[PDB]
Design a protein around this ligand. Structure first.
Ligand SMILES: [Mg+2]
Ligand SMILES: [Mg+2]
Ligand SMILES: [Mg+2]
Ligand SMILES: [Mg+2]
Ligand SMILES: [Mg+2]
Ligand SMILES: [Mg+2]
Ligand SMILES: [Mg+2]
Ligand SMILES: [Mg+2]
Ligand SMILES: [Mg+2]
Ligand SMILES: [Mg+2]
Ligand SMILES: [Mg+2]
Ligand SMILES: [Mg+2]
Ligand SMILES: [Mg+2]
Ligand SMILES: [Mg+2]
Ligand SMILES: [Mg+2]
Ligand SMILES: [Mg+2]
Ligand SMILES: [Mg+2]
Ligand SMILES: [Mg+2]
Ligand SMILES: [Mg+2]
Ligand SMILES: [Mg+2]
Ligand SMILES: [Mg+2]
Ligand SMILES: [Mg+2]
Ligand SMILES: [Mg+2]
Ligand SMILES: [Mg+2]
Ligand SMILES: [Mg+2]
Ligand SMILES: [Mg+2]
Ligand SMILES: [Mg+2]
Ligand SMILES: [Mg+2]
Ligand SMILES: [Mg+2]
Ligand SMILES: [Mg+2]
Ligand SMILES: [Mg+2]
Ligand SMILES: [Mg+2]
Ligand SMILES: [Mg+2]
Ligand SMILES: [Mg+2]
Ligand SMILES: [Mg+2]
Lengths: 154, 34, 87, 66, 233, 124
RNA sequence: AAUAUGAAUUAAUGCGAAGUUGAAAUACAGUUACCGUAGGGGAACCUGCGGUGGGCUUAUAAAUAUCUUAAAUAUUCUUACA
RNA sequence: AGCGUUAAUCAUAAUGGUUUAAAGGAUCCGUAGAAUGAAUUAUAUAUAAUUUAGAGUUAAUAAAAUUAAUUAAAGAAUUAUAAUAGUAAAGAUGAAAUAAUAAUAAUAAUUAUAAGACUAAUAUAUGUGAAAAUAUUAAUUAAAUAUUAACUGACAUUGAGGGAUUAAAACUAGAGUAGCGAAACGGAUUCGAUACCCGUGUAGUUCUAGUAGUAAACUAUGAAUACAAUUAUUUAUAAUAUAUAUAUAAAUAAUAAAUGAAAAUGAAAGUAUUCCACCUGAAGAGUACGUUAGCAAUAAUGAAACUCAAAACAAUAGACG
């Protein structure tokens, strides 16, 4: 869900503000994907499944017995007295969800304000959902996927 | 509203009340039978 | 027991610090003499030495002999003694 | 021996090892590494002929400081 | 207190000045600070073990990991309320260090109040230099006290001479007692010897105490008389 | 300010302009007939004697119009053209009689700013 | 039926002019001020009832305190001693 | 070869706000919502089958005796009447008088009857209630906390319109009426005194049945969810080997960060998401007209013309009291 995603973004921002190292997130598929995307772009130092109490050392299979207590632990990242993941504003908010075609995404990438989105920035990452798979907006353009403009990290 | 600002409003309300008191018989005359 | 933590104050100080000095000797003697004269009529010689002692005390002046640093300490140690959280 | 459990600046959390006797206890391997780093920079400025200034306002510290 | 940027970014700020020409000459510290960089990564780092005990902080016991019946014979089939709450503050707040020896220490001084009256120097000599074999109590650098007993108890526990802790403690206590008795006898006999061979002690401990009391009493008496006089008048 | 609220009528208050001269009826001038011609006392603190006049326009509504210039020529019936200025010190007069046209004559011996009054070019 | 214009007489309100009567408010504004409401009064207002602080968090003592080698020992010590 | 001016149009700040400046509905309940809202997999934002983390249901085990409504009790005093004995003042105020005060024998005192209305300490409104509210006792009926066990399987959030409750005053009936007390009358005060003080003291305050639906109905701060750095206090829960030092929550008080016009807010006035209400210069005005509702007072709804370049808040330094 999108509300959840917004909440996790807010939590990430809060954690960046006070400089915590290792932070929990809810264990869902969309959320996991988002976390993986951040990790690959280079905003998170670590990403690992775990309990509500902490990250897991060994593998523990997730079932109806565990699922309520399961959690996604995430390492934050800092360099020269400045946090890497400064912001996590989402674009498609729950009330005004926005879905762009490939042309619109291209325009956004090339410095054009679209549907009241400030076009994407030098060291920024706009994530895009396309058939229940979160991608970079550039990646989506390359693959040519009309998708929901999810969120924005800087 | 500060107290000073409120005091103008209070004064206005008082004036209105006075006007209503004055125009009671007149109001009565106007109301009944029309 | 019920502890009572104050808020952050501008300055911990007692408004007036009492020294609690001893009462005057001459005054005491005078009171004793008065007490003696309550009994034994006006001026009987039971209080013959007491009157003399009073006179000796109150010869140069009516009273014989003529401050507590508590504010300085409170002022000094307020910032320490606070449970004021960090900056 | 760190300050106290109730006089805690949480900014210093990484440095502290655990609490005991109602007192935070400073991780001492960490202390060592930081001391070494500090010692090296002290040596370097002395080598370069820099002006080192030792500041110590507490009561007993004067003689050792001098 | 906000994380100060300007205490650790000193060389960068000076490097900029040097580039500009605001600074003609480089500082003495500049090269040194370049060589040895500051930390500048003021994070809250999480901790996963209590160092004293060796308990695990991070882990959660699952429903599948608790198959057998509970106290009051109910099988756990669900996560409880506490198993759902996100326990992140436990990872970050520093661990309360616990030792088995602390309890033994507490017990000993309850059992032996007058051992507290034996003065204790807390100013450490080189902690690395020592090397005590707790096969016996009497170590060289260390004095005889409840601590030594406790160390002996711990040694016994480790070696499994006494498998039970209580028995080991008792044994250590009994070892201590004999030593204490011997110490007591030594001093008395030394005193006797001194008395025999014409040694002269100017002030004995009891005499000293009496003298100390006397001054206090004298102080009290004058004050008390004044107070009585005050009361009278 | 919620998205739904915005949809059902909410936003910034659009401001452009409000009519300075309503009685003029959305046009540059209107012809009028002077009724009376006054000398008004201004607001405090500035003081003078302002040569205003009352004018019934052709559209019907009556208006207090200012008369500029040092001296003027206006009776109780003169044909006068009104424009939408405002005499700032006199309250309740939101108009100017335009001075070259009508029975109102051009202001005499005017050298500077002649078109602002009626004044023709003197022609050597 | 609705709308528009007119109406003797009449009410409110605005702007100007600073005249008269008091002095209600701002300080403990010389009866704490204001909310709701009711009654009274030339006029501000006054009085009852409950409410509010946008007035009192403006907050700052009934006082007494202890014994171990005072020194040939501590106090000195400049990478020495061990 | 136009330049001025007037009349117009577009641009020129919502890349806004509502504790204190315009602006949170008195409070909750709940309908619509073309408002928003968990998990996993598979179908070609939906369907389908599975989940239990939200939201509920019922037990069990601990606690708590509070809030409603109703019925039954208690208490210090107050006034009035009467008796007793007793003597000249009493009562009041800044100081005085007027009065159902007193030489018809008072006031004070001691008794004895009656009447209403209030609830000292404990008390912190701590707590409890949706908010108005709510502390003498008891009973009845209703509702209420936490943790476990089991079950339901997103059933939720918010909520236009709507609905219900809503202090004090007011009103309509019928009781009641000690004390207090608008008004009125009288005495003071004062230049005056339609006041502040004193005295008589009617409505009212009290109960029963209603009407009405407003208050500085205020935390001047709508509800919900996720999240973020410390400390100290209590409160409850669990374990500990009943009294210890521990783990949880909850509240209260200081703060970090952050936000902020600042004052300051501090788990919200922070970081975010959702839904509703409301604001768009000051006067005129919550006025007029109109409509609806009310026994009425009134309540809600709610304009325009006319006139200004003002008007407002936080804080600063003075002067002043
Ligand atoms: Mg306001
Ligand atoms: Mg000119
Ligand atoms: Mg010219
Ligand atoms: Mg008709
Ligand atoms: Mg007319
Ligand atoms: Mg006067
Ligand atoms: Mg007066
Ligand atoms: Mg007044
Ligand atoms: Mg006063
Ligand atoms: Mg006054
Ligand atoms: Mg006043
Ligand atoms: Mg009156
Ligand atoms: Mg009042
Ligand atoms: Mg005031
Ligand atoms: Mg104040
Ligand atoms: Mg715009
Ligand atoms: Mg409210
Ligand atoms: Mg309001
Ligand atoms: Mg609701
Ligand atoms: Mg509420
Ligand atoms: Mg009470
Ligand atoms: Mg009340
Ligand atoms: Mg009533
Ligand atoms: Mg009645
Ligand atoms: Mg009266
Ligand atoms: Mg009702
Ligand atoms: Mg009203
Ligand atoms: Mg209201
Ligand atoms: Mg209230
Ligand atoms: Mg701060
Ligand atoms: Mg903000
Ligand atoms: Mg604001
Ligand atoms: Mg605060
Ligand atoms: Mg109308
Ligand atoms: Mg109304």
């Amino acid at each position: 869900s999108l509300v959840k995603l917004a909440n996790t973004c807010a939590h990430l921002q809060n954690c960046s503000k006070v400089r915590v190292a290792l932070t929990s997130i809810p264990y869902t598929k969309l959320q996991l994907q988002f976390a993986y995307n951040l990790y690959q772009q280079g905003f998170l130092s670590s990403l690992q499944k775990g309990s509500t109490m902490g990250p897991d050392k060994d593998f523990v299979e997730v079932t109806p017995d565990n699922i309520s207590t399961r959690r996604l632990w995430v390492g934050l990242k800092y360099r020269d007295n400045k946090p890497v993941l400064s912001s996590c504003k989402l674009i498609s908010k729950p009330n005004s969800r926005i879905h762009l075609p490939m042309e619109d995404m291209k325009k956004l990438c090339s410095g054009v304000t679209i549907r009241n989105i400030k076009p994407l920035q030098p060291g920024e990452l706009i994530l895009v959902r396309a058939h229940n798979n979160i991608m970079d907006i550039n990646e989506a353009i390359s693959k040519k996927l009309d998708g929901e403009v999810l969120c924005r990290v800087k | 509203d500060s107290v000073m600002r409120k005091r103008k409003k209070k004064m206005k309300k008082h004036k209105l009340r006075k006007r209503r008191k004055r125009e009671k018989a007149e109001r009565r005359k106007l109301s009944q039978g029309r | 027991p019920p502890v009572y933590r104050l808020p952050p104050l501008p300055r911990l100080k007692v408004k007036k610090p009492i020294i609690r000095q001893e009462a005057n000797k001459c005054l005491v003697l005078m009171s004793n003499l008065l007490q003696c004269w309550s009994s034994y009529g006006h001026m009987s010689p039971k209080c013959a030495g007491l009157v003399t002692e009073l006179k000796s005390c109150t010869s140069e002046s009516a009273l014989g002999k003529r401050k507590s640093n508590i504010n300085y300490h409170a002022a000094r140690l307020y910032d320490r003694i606070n449970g004021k959280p960090h900056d | 021996l760190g300050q106290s459990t109730s006089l805690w600046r949480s900014s210093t959390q990484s440095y502290i090892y655990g609490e005991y006797k109602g007192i935070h206890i400073i991780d001492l391997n960490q202390t060592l590494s930081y001391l070494k780093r500090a010692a090296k920079v002290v040596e370097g400025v002395s080598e370069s002929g820099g002006i080192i200034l030792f500041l110590g306002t507490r009561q007993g510290q004067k003689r050792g400081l001098e | 207190m906000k994380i100060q940027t300007n205490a650790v970014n000193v060389l960068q700020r000076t490097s900029a000045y040097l580039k500009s020409g605001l600074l003609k000459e480089t500082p003495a510290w500049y090269n040194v600070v370049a060589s040895i960089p500051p930390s500048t990564k003021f994070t809250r780092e999480p901790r996963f073990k209590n160092p004293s005990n060796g308990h695990i902080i991070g882990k959660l016991v699952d429903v599948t990991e608790q198959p057998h019946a509970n106290n009051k014979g109910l099988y756990k089939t669900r996560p409880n309320s506490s198993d759902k709450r996100v326990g992140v503050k436990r990872l970050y707040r520093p661990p309360k260090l616990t030792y088995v020896e602390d309890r033994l220490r507490s017990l000993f001084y309850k059992q032996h109040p007058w051992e507290l009256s034996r003065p204790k120097i807390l100013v450490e000599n080189e902690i690395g230099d020592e090397n005590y074999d707790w096969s016996h109590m009497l170590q060289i650098g260390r004095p005889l006290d409840g601590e030594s007993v406790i160390q002996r108890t711990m040694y016994l526990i480790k070696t499994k001479q006494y498998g039970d802790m209580v028995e080991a403690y008792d044994h250590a206590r009994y070892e201590f007692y004999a030593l204490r008795m011997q110490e007591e006898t030594e001093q008395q006999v030394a005193l006797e010897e001194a008395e025999m061979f014409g040694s002269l002690f100017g002030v004995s401990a009891i005499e000293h105490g009496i003298q100390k009391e006397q001054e206090v009493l004298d102080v009290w008496e004058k004050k008390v008389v004044e107070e009585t006089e005050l009361m009278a008048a | 300010a919620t998205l739904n609220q915005i949809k059902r009528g909410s936003g910034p208050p659009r401001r452009k302009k409000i009519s300075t001269a309503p009685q003029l009826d959305q046009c540059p001038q209107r012809k009028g007939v002077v009724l009376r011609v006054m000398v008004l006392k201004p607001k405090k603190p500035n003081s003078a004697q302002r040569k205003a006049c009352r004018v019934r326009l052709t559209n019907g509504n009556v208006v207090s119009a200012y008369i500029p210039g040092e001296g003027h020529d206006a009776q109780e019936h003169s044909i006068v053209y009104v424009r939408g200025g405002r005499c700032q010190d006199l309250p309740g007069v939101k108009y100017h009689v335009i001075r070259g046209a009508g029975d109102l004559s051009g202001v005499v011996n005017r050298i500077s700013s002649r078109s602002k009054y009626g004044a023709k070019k003197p022609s050597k």
